[PDB]
Amino acid sequence: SLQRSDREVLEHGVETGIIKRLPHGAYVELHQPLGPVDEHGHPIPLEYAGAPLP
């Protein structure tokens, strides 16, 4: 499960405070990617490198 947490951090970025989306009442944690970000919001997932993740 620690490995799974590392992978989720790699593929979604670090977690932060929640934001309510403008048009609708969606709640999104407003993550922060640790690597290059795709043209759209979601980032390009990184590959685990055997080192701790923030």
Binding site: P23, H24, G25, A26
Partner: protein
Amino acid sequence: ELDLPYGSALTSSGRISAVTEPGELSVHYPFPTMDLVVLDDALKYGSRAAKARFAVYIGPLGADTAATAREILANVPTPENAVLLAVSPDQRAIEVVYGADVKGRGIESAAPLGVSAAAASFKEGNLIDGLISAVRVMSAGVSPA
């Protein structure tokens, strides 16, 4: 455009908020829960070795069976490396289609084997068992990229 006959409404975003009457279900699949679980187990980890998205289409694929199979495969999330087995009992037809990335991995050799397993099981009278057998045979045949 029209939502479900009753109780389903388009929401502020794209998602459609749907409802079902208290006594009834939502999936309505005409198969036992256990056999559905077995087929899902197959498609999920008995195909992990193949590393190619294995898909099953029980719906009716009419007119040119091959071409309807092609486009229902196109509808698969990642047709690039995908193997769609379509069965229409209204037409007693099987059609298997493959993605371009799924080539030379033993898939073509496994195609007749999987179709034969499915046909044997169907003539025995077990749609779901035939689907599982075909998935197993095709996954065994297909090698990871």
